Amino acid sequence: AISKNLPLLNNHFRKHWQERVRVHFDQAGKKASRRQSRLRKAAKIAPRPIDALRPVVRAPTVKYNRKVRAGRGFTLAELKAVGIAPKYARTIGISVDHRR
Amino acid sequence: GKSRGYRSGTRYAFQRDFKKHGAIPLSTYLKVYKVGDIVDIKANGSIQKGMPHKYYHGKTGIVYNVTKSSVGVIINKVVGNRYIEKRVNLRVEHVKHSACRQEFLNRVKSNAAKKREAKANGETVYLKRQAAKPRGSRIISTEGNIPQTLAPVAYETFI
Amino acid sequence: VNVPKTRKTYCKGKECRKHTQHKVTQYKAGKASLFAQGKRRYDRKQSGYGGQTKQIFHKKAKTTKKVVLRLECVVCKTKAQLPLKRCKHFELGGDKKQKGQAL
Amino acid sequence: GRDHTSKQHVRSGHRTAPKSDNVYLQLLVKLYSFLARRTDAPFNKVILKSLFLSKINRPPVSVSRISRALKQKGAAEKTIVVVGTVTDDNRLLEFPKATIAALRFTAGAKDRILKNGGEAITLDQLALRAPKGQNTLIVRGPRNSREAVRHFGFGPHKGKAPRILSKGRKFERARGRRRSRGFKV
Amino acid sequence: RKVLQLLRLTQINAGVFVRLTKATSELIKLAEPYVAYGYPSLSTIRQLVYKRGFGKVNKQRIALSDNAIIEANLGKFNILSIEDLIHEIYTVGPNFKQVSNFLWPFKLSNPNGGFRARKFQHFIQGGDTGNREQFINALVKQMN
Amino acid sequence: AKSKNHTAHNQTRKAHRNGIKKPKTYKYPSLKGVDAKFKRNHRYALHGTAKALAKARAE
RNA sequence: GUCUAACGUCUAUGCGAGUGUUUGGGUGUAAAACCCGUACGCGUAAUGAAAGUGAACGAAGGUGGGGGCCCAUUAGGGUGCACCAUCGACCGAUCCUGAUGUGUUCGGAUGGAUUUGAGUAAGAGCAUAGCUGUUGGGACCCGAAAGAUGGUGAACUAUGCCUG
RNA sequence: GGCGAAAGACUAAUCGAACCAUCUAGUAGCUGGUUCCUGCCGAAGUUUCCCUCAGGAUAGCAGAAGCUCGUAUCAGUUUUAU
RNA sequence: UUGCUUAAUUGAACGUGGACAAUUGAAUGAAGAGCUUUUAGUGGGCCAUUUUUGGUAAGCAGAACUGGCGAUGCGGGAUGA
RNA sequence: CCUAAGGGGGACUCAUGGAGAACAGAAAUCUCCAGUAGAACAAAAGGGUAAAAGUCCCCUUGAUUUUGAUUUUCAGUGUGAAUACAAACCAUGAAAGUGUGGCCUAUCGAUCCUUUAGUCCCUCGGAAUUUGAGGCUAGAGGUGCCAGAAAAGUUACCACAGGGAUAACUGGCUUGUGGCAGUCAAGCGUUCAUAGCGACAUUGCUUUUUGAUUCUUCGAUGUCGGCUCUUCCUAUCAUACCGAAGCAGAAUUCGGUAAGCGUUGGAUUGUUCACCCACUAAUAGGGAACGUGAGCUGGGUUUAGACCGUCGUGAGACAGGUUAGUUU
RNA sequence: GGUUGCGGCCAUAUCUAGCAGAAAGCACCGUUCCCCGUUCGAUCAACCGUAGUUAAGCUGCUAAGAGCAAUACCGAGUAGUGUAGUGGGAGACCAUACGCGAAACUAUUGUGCUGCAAUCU
Numbered sequence A: 001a002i003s004k005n006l007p008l009l010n011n012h013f014r015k016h017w018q019e020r021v022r023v024h025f026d027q028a029g030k031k032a033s034r035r036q037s038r039l040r041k042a043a044k045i046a047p048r049p050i051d052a053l054r055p056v057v058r059a060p061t062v063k064y065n066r067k068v069r070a071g072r073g074f075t076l077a078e079l080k081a082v083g084i085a086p087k088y089a090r091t092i093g094i095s096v097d098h099r100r
Numbered sequence B: 001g002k003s004r005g006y007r008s009g010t011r012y013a014f015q016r017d018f019k020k021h022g023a024i025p026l027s028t029y030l031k032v033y034k035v036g037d038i039v040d041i042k043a044n045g046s047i048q049k050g051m052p053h054k055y056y057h058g059k060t061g062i063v064y065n066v067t068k069s070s071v072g073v074i075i076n077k078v079v080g081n082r083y084i085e086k087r088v089n090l091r092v093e094h095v096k097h098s099a100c101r102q103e104f105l106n107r108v109k110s111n112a113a114k115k116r117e118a119k120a121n122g123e124t125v126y127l128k129r130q131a132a133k134p135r136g137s138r139i140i141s142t143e144g145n146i147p148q149t150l151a152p153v154a155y156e157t158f159i
Numbered sequence C: 001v002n003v004p005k006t007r008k009t010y011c012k013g014k015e016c017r018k019h020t021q022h023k024v025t026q027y028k029a030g031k032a033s034l035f036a037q038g039k040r041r042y043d044r045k046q047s048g049y050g051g052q053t054k055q056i057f058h059k060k061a062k063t064t065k066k067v068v069l070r071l072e073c074v075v076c077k078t079k080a081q082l083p084l085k086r087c088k089h090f091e092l093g094g095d096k097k098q099k100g101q102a103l
Numbered sequence D: 001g002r003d004h005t006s007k008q009h010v011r012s013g014h015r016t017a018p019k020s021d022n023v024y025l026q027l028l029v030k031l032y033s034f035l036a037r038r039t040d041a042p043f044n045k046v047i048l049k050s051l052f053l054s055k056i057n058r059p060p061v062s063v064s065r066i067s068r069a070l071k072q073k074g075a076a077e078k079t080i081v082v083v084g085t086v087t088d089d090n091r092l093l094e095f096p097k098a099t100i101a102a103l104r105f106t107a108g109a110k111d112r113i114l115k116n117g118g119e120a121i122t123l124d125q126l127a128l129r130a131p132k133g134q135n136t137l138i139v140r141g142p143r144n145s146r147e148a149v150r151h152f153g154f155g156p157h158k159g160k161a162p163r164i165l166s167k168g169r170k171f172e173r174a175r176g177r178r179r180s181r182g183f184k185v
Numbered sequence E: 001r002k003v004l005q006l007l008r009l010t011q012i013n014a015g016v017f018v019r020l021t022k023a024t025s026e027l028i029k030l031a032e033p034y035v036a037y038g039y040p041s042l043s044t045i046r047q048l049v050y051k052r053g054f055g056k057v058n059k060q061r062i063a064l065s066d067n068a069i070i071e072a073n074l075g076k077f078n079i080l081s082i083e084d085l086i087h088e089i090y091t092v093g094p095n096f097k098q099v100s101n102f103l104w105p106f107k108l109s110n111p112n113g114g115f116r117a118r119k120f121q122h123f124i125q126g127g128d129t130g131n132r133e134q135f136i137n138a139l140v141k142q143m144n
Numbered sequence F: 001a002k003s004k005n006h007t008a009h010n011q012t013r014k015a016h017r018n019g020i021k022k023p024k025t026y027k028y029p030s031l032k033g034v035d036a037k038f039k040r041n042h043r044y045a046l047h048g049t050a051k052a053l054a055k056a057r058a059e
Numbered sequence G: 001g002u003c004u005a006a007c008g009u010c011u012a013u014g015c016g017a018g019u020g021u022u023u024g025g026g027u028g029u030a031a032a033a034c035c036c037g038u039a040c041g042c043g044u045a046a047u048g049a050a051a052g053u054g055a056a057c058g059a060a061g062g063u064g065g066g067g068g069c070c071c072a073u074u075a076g077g078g079u080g081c082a083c084c085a086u087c088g089a090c091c092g093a094u095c096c097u098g099a100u101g102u103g104u105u106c107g108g109a110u111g112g113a114u115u116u117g118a119g120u121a122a123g124a125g126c127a128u129a130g131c132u133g134u135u136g137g138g139a140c141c142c143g144a145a146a147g148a149u150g151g152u153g154a155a156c157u158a159u160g161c162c163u164g
Numbered sequence H: 001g002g003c004g005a006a007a008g009a010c011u012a013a014u015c016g017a018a019c020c021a022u023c024u025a026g027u028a029g030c031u032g033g034u035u036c037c038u039g040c041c042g043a044a045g046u047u048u049c050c051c052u053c054a055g056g057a058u059a060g061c062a063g064a065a066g067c068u069c070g071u072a073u074c075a076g077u078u079u080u081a082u
Numbered sequence I: 001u002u003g004c005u006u007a008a009u010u011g012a013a014c015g016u017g018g019a020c021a022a023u024u025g026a027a028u029g030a031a032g033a034g035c036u037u038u039u040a041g042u043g044g045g046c047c048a049u050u051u052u053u054g055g056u057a058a059g060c061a062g063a064a065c066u067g068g069c070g071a072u073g074c075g076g077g078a079u080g081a
Numbered sequence J: 001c002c003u004a005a006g007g008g009g010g011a012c013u014c015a016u017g018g019a020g021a022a023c024a025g026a027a028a029u030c031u032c033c034a035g036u037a038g039a040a041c042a043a044a045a046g047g048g049u050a051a052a053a054g055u056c057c058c059c060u061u062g063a064u065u066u067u068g069a070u071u072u073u074c075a076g077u078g079u080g081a082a083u084a085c086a087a088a089c090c091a092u093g094a095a096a097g098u099g100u101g102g103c104c105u106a107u108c109g110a111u112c113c114u115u116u117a118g119u120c121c122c123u124c125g126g127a128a129u130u131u132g133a134g135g136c137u138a139g140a141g142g143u144g145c146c147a148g149a150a151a152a153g154u155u156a157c158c159a160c161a162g163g164g165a166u167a168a169c170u171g172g173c174u175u176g177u178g179g180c181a182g183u184c185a186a187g188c189g190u191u192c193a194u195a196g197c198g199a200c201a202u203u204g205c206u207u208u209u210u211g212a213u214u215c216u217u218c219g220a221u222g223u224c225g226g227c228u229c230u231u232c233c234u235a236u237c238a239u240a241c242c243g244a245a246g247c248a249g250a251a252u253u254c255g256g257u258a259a260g261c262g263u264u265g266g267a268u269u270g271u272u273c274a275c276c277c278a279c280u281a282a283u284a285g286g287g288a289a290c291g292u293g294a295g296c297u298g299g300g301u302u303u304a305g306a307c308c309g310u311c312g313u314g315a316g317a318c319a320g321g322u323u324a325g326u327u328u
Numbered sequence K: 001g002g003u004u005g006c007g008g009c010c011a012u013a014u015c016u017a018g019c020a021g022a023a024a025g026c027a028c029c030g031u032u033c034c035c036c037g038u039u040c041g042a043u044c045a046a047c048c049g050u051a052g053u054u055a056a057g058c059u060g061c062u063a064a065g066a067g068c069a070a071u072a073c074c075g076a077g078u079a080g081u082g083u084a085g086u087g088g089g090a091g092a093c094c095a096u097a098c099g100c101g102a103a104a105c106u107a108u109u110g111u112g113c114u115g116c117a118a119u120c121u
């Protein structure tokens, strides 16, 4: 059971693992269907853009201090500073975040 | 029950020589050992500190370390299909200089002396040793030594 | 075995670094705390059903124990520990041997 | 019958050809098989043997190794020969003008050699300007720096690297690696 | 076995020349129960070298069919001919070692007329092993 | 049951197929186990020796 | 004696202090081929339980060898990559010493030590594939006596009852 | 579980714990088997540890891949000295 | 050269420079020497000569060295590991 | 087991013998001489030791601290044990020196947990203080199956995987044991070793005893005895022919050639064996897979039911007794 | 050459019994105030070199001496042993072949050699 100068392994296969094997044969099919869904959304709302405007926020933790990424919504103070009500902003393609 | 202690089976190996027990003659403590010296190992039963194991009794090796009362000797021991380098710390009572050095070191001097003499005389000399060769021809004089004839003797009982 | 109640050995205390006088005492194991993590873990594992969850030693073979001397420096109060060999009989500061006496 | 003093029918144990099926490496072997067979120059016989070597037997030569070899006394204008890949070294502060013949050059290496006025030629171009390897200097990369060699000859008190998947305080550090946990080897 | 290997006697009916001293004498003494040896005459050496003489050239067994092979391999030892080689063997010369090691071990046939009734006993006791001295010439005559 | 207890038969055959090899000799033996006091000073003597030879060649 | 997840050695290949397009996005003659990039994985730094600290005295060291190359002219000299043996240097841990100073208990300069690390000492790795070997999986194929869960039986039979 | 004027007896030819399906391809250091050719090489039953004694791990013996070199310095042998 | 050692300018170890040239220091041999990685099977043995233990002995049990059988056909021992 | 029985130094010389001294004798204490160790050194044995390692006295704690290297077992892993040094701090001695437990070779113990000592150092992760907890290094608590599970029985109701790697038949080697036979001849035999015997010794044979072993068989060779029947051996009980006698006859005993020919009926017992009764010329001993169960029988042994005695708390055991129990 | 001090090898030096010993040395020898140690100035410590002696120690010589050491036409190429045979013998064991080769025994000879320093008829 233990033999030779080999690394000691941790292969977690002592349960009925073979009843829960998900093989993504449909990777290409989901890619294609996602593109078709995306086309449908675009044709549904044209010429209105498919993407809501997202804010820019600093990433948390000491490891991602340096990076900055897309947030979820503009703060109430930020929308107040440009004179847009959040209820109105959600209807003109602007994302709101009451939490930030 | 098996017994396999450190000094098992050393009843006669570690005995003192007959009529040679007791105090150590002091030339043993006056000899000087240098790193690289070739030494014979012979355990002295009367000194139990720095005593060799029974394997090294009768072995010859190279001094590698010199301490207050001891020398370190390098021995090559067979372990299976190879040699392992063994480093044994031995008090100088169990150690003696090997006499094999003095024969070869003298032959080196003799070869050097003979070569310069032949070089001085402008001749050549051969320094390689030779095994004993079959003897040459010879003439046996029989003056006073005329051959005496022997015969096998009859059987006798002497009790 | 008889061991005197005082001894002069090396003291490892930073102040001393030398042989000083020490007080010899037999070491006694301290009381087992209830909040040591191994005892904390043991109580949790034994709780509930399942019976005895850890082994109980039975096959005793030793008939003695190693005596440990507690050496307290009289100068700096630093303690030191010395284990002795296995002895069936041990006294500390007993009556010293009297050689030459009669039966 | 014969009392055999050696094993019978034993292959030499050396490569006599590349294991590679690259046709262009065969052409280089074609050229130096002819050169080694016919020039009496020891350089060409060495090159032919080195062309057979496996990837781990031709470790990459950094452009820093060539710089140090050219810094030998009287070797500044020698032709550096590398039977293998020449890699770049971004830790160098400067590189000289040099002629280097190699199997392969990295993008940084070729840029650096040509930037400093040198040439980056192949081994067939070497064979015409130096058919006997005159005024050359063969450079080999470090063989014992490979990661697999860390674990070779592992054992007690050998100081080699354990074959291990994770590294940390919980991974092969307690008993046999520490006197407080029994012994240490 | 090691002694026979060091004498290059690794098959039956293999013959080799040995210069008698002490080291080689104690060697032959160790191999004595397995070999027949003796003192060869000049004609025996000549016949051996002429019919079954081979040289070791690049570790190959090459027939001694021309004096150029001998010169090319032993001219630095002053051997330029097959007769130089025979002389160097017979009157044991200063280059006996090189000449005898250059000679491939002679691969003789079995005796024409057979051996004695039982080989593996000393020549003195009516067998074939050991030193037969001048009868080595008759034995080689049977086998070469 | 009862089996064979011990035998050294065939063990010299196995040791002599590829072993019975004398150890290689090198010009410099390892100084492992040599006296620390000598080893400490031998470090200073060798370092000074290298300096003297370096200066003589630099001249 | 298989396939798979994760691995050891060796080999071939691409690129190389980097490497891996395929999670995803683009694209398409549509599960293909072609294209894209942020991250991330591994590698590029180790050591200590940790707080932490963190790799050039020197031409990135000396000595004895060392293929090849250079000068020669048997010989001889120079240079000597890989690699071997040996003596050193640097980083971390452990122990010793303890400068100017100071939240007076912190700081830790400087100089050391038969101690110790899977380190540095002009990077070698990453990825794909193949054989062989390993571990978990039904695990080369067939094989228990057993254990568990949930159900079906008193048409035989055992016993009680009711009616003949 | 039943049932037993008690034999561990009867409980559908099944009883010292029925039948049916599933967990289940249960596990087995133990049996048995294990499918084409030729070529080259070619063993071990020995060391140490193991609730180890029909089994493993470990070292040894063997194969394969080779690598650095090219007579360098090796040997199941002798001689001489000790 | 040193921080070791000596009363020392004594030694210890490692060195610079110089001399001793192919009989460079016995024989014989050498399908060359050295090195590395990885992995199989095996881990019941038995026999012969000699040494040898227990036992009255054993086609018995147990060791030593070597050679064999096992794993091996061929000629002989009629037959036979 | 030992605060000395460890360490250092010093002084002395033990076992024993001889010759002497009131009580005093084989043994009390004193004296001289001799005394190579013939003693003593904790303990088994071996080695070692004499101005000592033994005996006595004085001083002590080196039986201490930090850890590396090495030797043995060895895989050159662990453990145990030991060796020579490095850096300290000490003891002793005038000093040189010696001392890192016991003169040497045995005298012992991992992970996990706990506890103590040390560093008073690191952490409890939003920041602190103090408790508490967790870390690092060294000991102790222990695994004696001693490289170290936590562990009672029974099955005659029984199961499975296997094993001739291993017992219970036959067979094979051996022949202690059993059985049978020789030789040497001290004695026996009224005299008289050998008509017939024959001690102390010693040489053999046999395989109908019992041992010894475990080679064959455990995907099975039907394990007792009897009945029935055939054949073979001879170490011959009877019958034939002979030789010998301590053979007058009659009877009897020993032997040679001899297995041609026969060797029984019953009471008790499952018996093999035994023992009795009786006839007979005699009622010899054996083999043939301890011949012979697809020939029988099934009394015994040895499944399951049941009784008793002894044993066991009990389930149950008994190679103890008893009764019933499928022979294809 | 003798002698002393310090030695190396550690009996050719030891052991027993006799005899001899010039010079110097050594020794025995004389004393107890002092340092010191004892039951005892016997040992140990100290003092004198003054009163005496080679009696002893020590040294040398003697002994068909014991022991020890060395040697060998001593025993003996014996015992033993490595290797060999399809040698002998029922066996136990034995012979032969190529090699190695004792111990006891017997005889003879010997009985310390020597280094450093100082000293002496």
Ligand SMILES: CC(=O)O[C@@H]1[C@@H](O)[C@H](O[C@H]2[C@H](OC(=O)[C@H]3CC[C@@H]4[C@H](C3)O[C@@]3(C[C@H](OC(=O)/C=C/c5ccccc5)[C@H](C)CO3)[C@]43CO3)O[C@H](C)[C@@H](O)[C@@H]2OC(C)=O)O[C@H](C)[C@H]1O
Pocket (backbone or CB within 6 Å): C032, C038, C039, C042, C054, C055, C056, C057, J112, J113, J114, J141, J142
């Ligand atoms: C009553 C009784 O006798 O049973 C005790 C049991 O009570 C004890 O359980 C303790 C329990 O034991 C364990 O968890 C294991 C820890 C280590 C293992 C083992 C038991 O102890 C061992 C064995 C051996 O030392 C002993 O034996 C330990 C005795 C002990 C007793 C009390 C507390 C701690 C230890 C090794 C030296 C290492 O330590 C170890 C490797 O086997 O630890 C808890 C902390 C304690 O509370 C608990 O003690 C109490 C009061 O019940 O474990 C012992 C082995 C049993 O003998």
Ligand SMILES: [Mg+2]
Pocket (backbone or CB within 6 Å): B001
């Ligand atoms: Mg016993």
Ligand SMILES: [Mg+2]
Pocket (backbone or CB within 6 Å): B001, B002, B003
């Ligand atoms: Mg014994």
Ligand SMILES: [Mg+2]
Pocket (backbone or CB within 6 Å): B012, B013, B014, B015, B016
């Ligand atoms: Mg001896």
Ligand SMILES: [Mg+2]
Pocket (backbone or CB within 6 Å): none
């Ligand atoms: Mg000791």
Ligand SMILES: [Mg+2]
Pocket (backbone or CB within 6 Å): B124, B125, B126, I023
């Ligand atoms: Mg010459």
Ligand SMILES: [Mg+2]
Pocket (backbone or CB within 6 Å): C010, C011, C012, C013, C022, C071, C072, C073, C078, C079, C080
């Ligand atoms: Mg203290």
Ligand SMILES: [Mg+2]
Pocket (backbone or CB within 6 Å): none
């Ligand atoms: Mg803890």
Ligand SMILES: [Mg+2]
Pocket (backbone or CB within 6 Å): C047
């Ligand atoms: Mg709870």
Ligand SMILES: [Mg+2]
Pocket (backbone or CB within 6 Å): C048
């Ligand atoms: Mg509860």
Ligand SMILES: [Mg+2]
Pocket (backbone or CB within 6 Å): C048, C049, C050
């Ligand atoms: Mg539970």
Ligand SMILES: [Mg+2]
Pocket (backbone or CB within 6 Å): C045, C046, C047, C048, C049, C050, C051, C053
């Ligand atoms: Mg529980």
Ligand SMILES: [Mg+2]
Pocket (backbone or CB within 6 Å): D001, D002
């Ligand atoms: Mg052939």
Ligand SMILES: [Mg+2]
Pocket (backbone or CB within 6 Å): D008
């Ligand atoms: Mg072969």
Ligand SMILES: [Mg+2]
Pocket (backbone or CB within 6 Å): D012, D013
């Ligand atoms: Mg080779």
Ligand SMILES: [Mg+2]
Pocket (backbone or CB within 6 Å): D095, D096, D097, D098, D099, D112, D113, D114, D115, D116, D117, D118, D119
């Ligand atoms: Mg350039």
